[PDB]
Symmetry: C3
Subunit: 382 residues, 3 copies
């Protein structure tokens, strides 16, 4: 699956400096090799953020205490309960018909109030997390044979590595997220985590609060009061909303949390590598035979807004795969945008291709091998 | 009006590789040429996203049904209506005065409640759309004579093109939006100029109107357009606050319009900076000379570009081609150049040129194209009215 | 604290073009020098935006003016007040007990409503500002001796400079913010009352503040009832409570949050860098290649500490032979084989004139920073949007 460095990808200076440009997409590998030196495998190993900050916590199922009521007769003042003016409570004030039937001197409306301590049922929280674009780590690894590690972030872009035989190598890597972080929120339950849209998450009609806060806001979204009955007032629990939520999350890309690491499954790093006094071994792929392809794995949803596929090649390896795509009715405009920097068929493997396509009806072409693909439009959620 | 590749913009290696760096702003072109080969024109043709996701839908003018009221005598329990527990309904509960005048045994307060179904009048929605930074396409084009296409995104940055005489050239383009997408929202009204605007996230979110998501049947905060009157024994009135379109259109005055072409939501600002890798060939350089600082005239004076930048065109009477000396200063600080050009390399060619786009600090500035000057006032940043 | 250009950082072409790559963090300098030419100092001088747009204004202390009350007897219809249908007013409707004790014919509940005008106390606003990623300026400066200026933005990346001796050099600088702008809001209190008065807060924290709010230009406030509570009615009176000044509660919450550095109309960012590709013609670049510093001649001049903007900073002292590159690494307690240190400082070195400064980001939790054999423990607090 590793690719070999191409001549066009590096420049050799007059004073002995060699500048190599690499594009490493998550799970992509490139093998670089200098004359008289062991081939090195370089690849972006992971992209993640350690425990990203918690934003809102939504209550999916309220937990109400027994109801507390307070009534007054048509002459005694207004009714009151300690619970009014306390956190974590939902209250309703009203008037009820009073008379001799219920211990009152006069006939008439009496002041009545009902409160309830509203908390969330254990394990019934939906917590949202936000990424800090500058805290997302992109880990690159270098290892002998066609072992060192270096991590970058938007803020940390330059490093120096000692690759033995290669000496001191300067690594300048421009990091790039495959997800629009600003518009993203990781929804988590106590599939338990999903990658949802900021706007969708913010408008969820549920009680909410920040971590640390003890009481909930808009608790009345799950707690309603009924009409008063002289000296009683019913309270309604709108029930558990987990079902409705899971139904809405159907099909939404899941978040991949490993321990405390919140992984992104899409993205890349493009680095400029600086080497001294040595000769890089180039290589220039030839175009693969346009007719010796077969679908090893037909185009399918990658699980993160992209299309992946695998082809099998019977021709002479290694070679560059000819990939292109068209939008139904426009056979002259290539609309395929590859995530895979250099799709190739090697001797050990290759044939994997990841790309982005315009929404609608498309036809993917790997040489003469074709296959149609429907790209759903963008949405923030149900 | 294309520009010619300069020597400083490319390096030729010892093993025969040539690395070319290009900056292509939307609408900008660069002509590259190699010995014994046809000159190629390279440019950023368009930047856009196909059907961006819909966020909120705002109701500009409510459409109510028929009011429904229910009352009870000072002894009959509380009044109730079915609508009280249904979607798409706005209700109000209160206490009214009842006596013999209205068919009640006793004199006193009696329960009463009114409800109405609230929907939005057809073609009276304001819909917001959000861009997906990673789904914005930057289409670069290559064509002979001083034709191929390649599109890039934040995620898709590398490609290989076969440009005939030039062979296989690698294209590595770093995409860059000219608009802060995270803080942007495209506001749109229903079909049946202008009908779409580029508004600020924070402004959009705080609009005081009823709203809902596409697909949802009912509206939230429907009472922002529906208000109930005081109760009258056995009647209670329901008010509709009217069409807010006028108010909104007023607030959108001067706001940059969105350019929607079919399903394509275009950005009118941005650029791509690419590194082009070519093998075994000889790049023809070229190095412009400063234009005569005194042979300039305003073909089109500095003006708002329509997308938070200043544009202008100058005429040159000297010997072409040459590089235009552009700079600007903030009134009172004639030593600091505050002009930041969007136009990578402003030049006067033989076929044309003379166009310049740039950003300037807010306040009073003076633009200088050689000795030709012109004042310009830059308004500060705002999220809208 | 300038560093010298290294050989690996530049390529000299066959036709005489030299391509130089520089990484300039805010406050970082790099000295470049060519054969028979004066050394030039190049650095990122400042990062800022001139007067960012205002978003929400929050009221910290309401100015309630008068309490209008209106009542009715058990038979006269509902009570009403003009203020009930005006902006800038908080109203409450209820029912009171009426009889002969209070001028009413019958005994029973009577309509009653109370309203109060609501504005904000002078100088008691909390205003939010939003940055415009494309309007943040990154100013680079070039000056002789180991003076010109060039500013860049996400949109303005290319420039041509005339550095005399060096001639016309092309500058291509890719700008990069050290702050997640989309998730940032500058919270500001009415200056001239404490001249910190500005903070760099999280948008999700800012948006959820439970206070009355409005946009600049708007005359009235939204959710004014967040600072006004009504009491129970008493026949023909109803009290109105001002929930009081919230300034204290807020300042308490901002404790520890990074301050925003405003200088005049310039809202400065204190983190971020620029990486440029410099293009030079016909000249020969003087390289230089640092040697690793003596792994044992280091001492803490300033131990690892919070930088004030989400990073760790430190300074060491070197007694060995200068100049040299500092060996910096860090490990997450229990994994002595993985370097988790991410340097903000592009090339940490000990020069003759100075050096020794190091800025870096570390994973949350317990870490051990290693500058050679010199070590030091560091606890990194996790991410949060605020209290």
């Amino acid at each position: 699956r590793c690719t070999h460095l191409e001549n066009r990808d590096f420049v050799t200076g007059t004073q002995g400096t060699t500048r190599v440009t690499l594009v490493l997409e998550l799970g992509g590998c490139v093998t670089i090799t200098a004359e008289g030196k062991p081939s090195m495998d370089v690849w972006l190993d992971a992209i993640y953020q350690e425990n990203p900050a918690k934003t809102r916590e939504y209550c999916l199922h309220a937990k109400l205490s027994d109801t507390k009521v307070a009534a007054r007769c048509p002459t005694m003042g207004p009714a009151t309960l300690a619970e009014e003016h306390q956190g974590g409570t939902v209250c309703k004030r009203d008037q009820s018909d009073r008379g001799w039937g219920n211990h009152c001197g006069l006939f008439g409306k009496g002041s009545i109030v009902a409160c309830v301590k509203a908390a969330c049922e254990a394990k019934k929280k939906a917590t949202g997390h936000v990424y800090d674009a500058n805290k997302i780590v992109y880990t690159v690894k270098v290892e002998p044979h066609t072992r060192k590690t270096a991590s970058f972030t938007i803020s940390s872009e330059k490093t120096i590595l000692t690759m033995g035989e290669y000496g001191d190598v300067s690594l300048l890597c421009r990091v790039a997220s495959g997800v629009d972080l600003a518009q993203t929120v990781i929804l988590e339950l106590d599939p338990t985590a999903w990658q949802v849209h900021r706007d969708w998450f913010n408008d969820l009609a549920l009680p909410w609060k920040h971590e640390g806060a003890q009481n909930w806001n808009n608790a009345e979204r799950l707690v309603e009061f009924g009409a008063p009955h002289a000296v009683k007032m019913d309270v309604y629990n709108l029930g558990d909303q987990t079902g409705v939520l899971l139904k809405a999350l159907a099909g939404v890309p899941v978040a991949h949390i490993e321990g405390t690491k919140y992984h992104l499954k899409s993205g890349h790093v493009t680095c400029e590598v600086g080497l001294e006094k040595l000769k890089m071994k180039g290589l220039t792929y030839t175009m693969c035979d346009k007719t010796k392809f077969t679908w090893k794995r037909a185009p399918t949803d990658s699980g993160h807004d992209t299309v992946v596929m695998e082809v099998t090649f019977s021709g002479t390896k290694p070679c560059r795969i000819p990939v292109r795509a068209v939008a139904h009715g426009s056979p002259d405009v290539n609309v395929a945008m590859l995530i895979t920097p250099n799709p190739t068929i090697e001797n050990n493997g290759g044939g994997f291709i990841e790309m982005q396509l315009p929404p609608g009806d498309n036809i993917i072409y790997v040489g003469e091998l074709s296959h149609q693909w429907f790209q759903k439009g963008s949405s923030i959620g149900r």
